[PDB]
Design a protein around this ligand. Structure first.
Ligand code: HHB
Length: 289
């Protein structure tokens, strides 16, 4: 039971607590409702209510009652994780991959221009609709929560930027570009790019593909908190082996999203101008709800 909602249904375990599909009692509208497992965060998250962009899941409300905290979002019917699983036999068509990447970059460019990072992008917080839109959920929450324990559930590391895995306590816009590059690669190949089981397995999967980073490609890397001079030194592989059959435009863009040094990583705004998007369109997905 809930005072202000009816037909409340669990839909997932999230970074911060249970996520429900719920119907507002007064209006009948269907929303996603994210009970935070437990004020500097309430004011800061409440600022996120002001943000509106077509590629960002609207934060409709912040409800603080009975010493509980709930976030109310507009509801979308499928996430990219489920869509990629449903699309595993055929693959997502390239024009739709390109459309989704373009739209996600517009959402990131918007948030970043408003000084809001995500820090934890992953297919589970990318939501799609029947009209061909994709939207990013949960921007700004990681900073407000303070990176921080809000679930006992197993955290996905697969999309974490190397700066994060090497113990850098200082985030930048580049962490979100890394995560989206990993998601791009996964849409293309139908396999996660770096499916690490632990922080060190995550870090070593990255190193085995992109080469072990050094001061030449990443000035400052050897001073990062969790950097170890004893890390094995892997040579770097070609993106042509990693994301076939992606064309050279897509591989060029992906390589710019996956530079080791966050400062060298392409921005969302610059990525939107990349030649890969010259022929972008907005196709209709085949969604089975
Ligand atoms: O909480 C998490 O970490 C991800 C997560 C998990 C489950 C649902 C969401 N969000 C939304 C938003 C809108 N329509 C549907 N689901 C996010």
């Amino acid at each position: 039971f809930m005072e202000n909602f009816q037909k409340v249904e669990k839909i997932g375990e999230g970074t911060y607590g249970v996520v429900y599909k719920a119907r507002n009692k007064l209006t009948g509208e269907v929303v996603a409702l994210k009970k935070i497992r437990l004020s500097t965060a309430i004011r800061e998250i409440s600022l996120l209510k002001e943000l509106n962009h077509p590629n960002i899941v609207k934060l409709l409300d912040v409800i603080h009652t009975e010493n509980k905290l709930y976030l109310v979002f507009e509801f979308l019917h499928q996430d990219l994780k489920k869509f990629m699983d449903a699309s595993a036999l055929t693959g997502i068509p390239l024009p739709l991959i390109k459309s989704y990447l373009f739209q996600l970059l517009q959402g990131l460019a918007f948030c970043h221009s408003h000084r809001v990072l995500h820090r934890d992008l992953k297919p589970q917080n990318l939501l799609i609709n029947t009209e061909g839109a994709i939207k990013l959920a949960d921007f700004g929450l990681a900073r407000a929560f303070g990176v921080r324990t809000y679930t006992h559930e197993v955290v996905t590391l697969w999309y974490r930027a190397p700066e994060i895995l090497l113990g850098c306590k200082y985030y930048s816009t580049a962490v979100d570009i890394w995560s989206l590059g990993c998601i791009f690669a996964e849409m293309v190949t139908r396999r996660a790019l770096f499916p690490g089981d632990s922080e060190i397995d995550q870090l070593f999967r990255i190193f085995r593909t992109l080469g072990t980073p050094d001061e030449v490609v990443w000035p400052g890397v050897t001073s990062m908190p969790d950097y170890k001079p004893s890390f094995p030194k892997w040579a770097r592989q070609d993106f042509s082996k990693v994301v076939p059959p992606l064309d050279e435009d897509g591989r060029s863009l992906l390589s710019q999203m996956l530079h080791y040094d966050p400062n060298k990583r392409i921005s969302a705004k610059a990525a939107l101008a990349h030649p890969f998007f010259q022929d972008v369109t907005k196709p209709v997905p085949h969604l089975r709800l």
